[PDB]
Design a binder for this molecule. Structure first.
Ligand SMILES: *[C@@H]1O[C@H](CO)[C@@H](O[C@@H]2O[C@H](CO)[C@@H](O[C@@H]3O[C@H](CO[C@H]4O[C@H](CO)[C@@H](O)[C@H](O)[C@@H]4O)[C@@H](O)[C@H](O[C@H]4O[C@H](CO)[C@@H](O)[C@H](O)[C@@H]4O)[C@@H]3O)[C@H](O)[C@H]2NC(C)=O)[C@H](O)[C@H]1NC(C)=O
Ligand SMILES: *[C@@H]1O[C@H](CO)[C@@H](O)[C@H](O)[C@H]1NC(C)=O
Lengths: 99, 199, 100, 200
């Protein structure tokens, strides 16, 4: 629920890597709320968004919290459809933070 | 999907096995491969992984015409990285093995447990101790592997060319892998087991 | 420009949730927009997995697949309250933005 | 139903340049804290840098007679609780403190030059706009003038002539030049009418 390292088996083919594989790999990523050290700016941003006092900008809406993000990574390795071992560095998260 | 892929995925599902497999996979990947680092990680894999996972990973059964299953089985240890690009004479390989106390130990074990006592496949000890000693050679100077993607024969990466007065001794060493009823039947039995387990 | 940048809007002090009461409007500045330029290999694979339907939703918020547009610097906001007294609240308004 | 002092504050906020300058002194002049010299310096910059019409709208804003909220806003616009000493000194002592700083002496000279009445009617020695600029040019100096009431438009220095001794008249003359000066009163009054009309 709060900001934490998460883990799931995913198809290598979903990773968007080009190399084709029939393997699943463990992939780790970061997600969750960063509602703790609540800043004056974020409190007011959240107030204004709640009061609807801000016209929405072009693009993404502003976030009123730090984002749950990875701080460190490890490689992901797998055998591709031709049975060649492949490795991609820094693809999988190993730690998270509120950034 | 084939049982080689299934057993690879059983390892992935196990946190401890997945970590040991990824580690050699990473060390044995790419054209930039560092052979001695890959070999170290293979030794570690077979040393530390649960025997049923390590045996399932490598000794996995493939249907008659399943080239993809056999190619996977044949490349599981990353032989393009683990094996020297040029195959030396087989006795030289043994010599290099004798020169390293760990390798020397692993070869003695394999010679002890995988000695055939008859044509039926009776081993000097037990089938399961033979398999353990066999996989104990992977990541050493005498790393055995599957020869083909259509059959289950296994061999060292070496030749008996340039052997001279030492031809028979050389072919005898090769024979412990090619013409060994104990080793052959132990691998074939385990593969049958793995088939039947899933079925 | 939908890319991460500093945005400015005139807002009622009353909507800022400050507890000082004021009839004034203030310029409030904040950061928002896309950071897809600053995506890592992890980010790119995480965007692919999400685009692909590959991940079960974790509890709480959706994972983000790119840096967040966030203030890198702040300044105070100042106004006169309903009693005609000048008030200042520090670090309320952004002055610069980053893909963080 | 916002009063015009609030509306004119907001016209400043609407102008990028004036907003930044008003925010700057508002920050410098806030809180039970306030470093008085920093507040005074931000006031001086504000009247120096802001467009004259924005600065005069902000301060010389009109209030209905019974609108004490407007008058109080107008009286506190320059943050007098920060800008002014909490003890009002003798006016002649205050001018002496003024005379000691070249900037303040010069601002006081121009206020005397432009805001001197040329007749009993309140004609200014130059023109009303020059008088207003010289009057506002004293805000942030030792001689900072300000509205005295929330119910009328009278202005004064923050000084007293009590304890002026044998110099009582000299003191009242200086004080009076701000507190009862028909040129200054008429210049302020006309500008306030203009402000009411702009918004009508
Ligand atoms: C705009 O509105 C203002 C605000 O009301 C009026 O200004 C006041 O004007 C009156 C009358 O001139 C001033 O009255 C004087 O009080 C002096 C004491 O002042 C101090 O004390 C009070 C504390 O309660 C403070 O408010 C003030 O800040 C000072 O600290 C008295 O000593 C004076 O007394 C003398 O006059 C009376 C009446 O003749 C005599 O009975 C006494 O014997 C003595 O001689 C006087 O009472 C008041 O001080 C002013 N206040 C302010 C803040 O300036 C403006 O007149 C009005 N402008 C116009 C043009 O109408
Ligand atoms: C398997 O194939 C290899 C070469 O592809 C061959 O040399 C070997 O004898 C075969 N083994 C069996 C048991 O047929």
């Amino acid at each position: 629920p709060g900001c934490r390292l998460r883990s799931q088996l995913v198809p290598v083919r979903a990773l968007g890597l080009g190399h084709r594989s029939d393997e699943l790999v463990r992939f780790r990523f970061c997600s969750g709320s960063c509602r703790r050290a609540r800043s004056p700016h974020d409190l007011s941003l959240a107030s204004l968004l709640g009061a609807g006092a801000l016209r929405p900008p072009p693009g993404s809406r502003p976030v009123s919290q730090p984002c749950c993000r990875p701080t460190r990574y490890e490689a992901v390795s797998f055998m591709d459809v031709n049975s060649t071992w492949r490795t991609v560095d820094r693809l999988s998260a190993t730690a998270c933070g509120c950034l | 999907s084939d049982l080689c892929l299934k057993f690879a995925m059983l390892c992935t599902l196990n946190d401890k096995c997945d970590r040991l497999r990824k580690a050699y996979g990473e060390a044995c990947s790419g054209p930039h491969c560092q052979r001695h680092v890959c070999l170290r990680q293979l030794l570690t894999f077979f040393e530390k992984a649960a025997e049923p996972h390590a045996q399932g990973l490598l000794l996995c059964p493939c249907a008659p015409n399943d080239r993809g299953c056999g190619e996977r089985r044949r490349n599981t240890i990353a032989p393009n990285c683990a094996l020297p690009p040029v195959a030396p004479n087989c006795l030289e390989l043994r010599r290099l093995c004798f020169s390293d106390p760990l390798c020397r130990s692993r070869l003695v074990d394999f010679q002890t447990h995988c000695h055939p006592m008859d044509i039926l496949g009776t081993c000097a000890t037990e089938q399961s101790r033979c398999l353990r000693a066999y996989l104990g050679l992977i990541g050493t100077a005498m790393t055995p592997n599957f020869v083909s993607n259509v059959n289950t024969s296994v061999a060292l990466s070496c030749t008996c060319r340039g052997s001279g007065n030492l031809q028979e001794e050389c072919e005898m060493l090769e024979g412990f892998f090619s013409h060994n009823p104990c080793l052959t039947e132990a691998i074939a039995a385990k593969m049958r087991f793995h088939s039947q387990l899933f079925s």
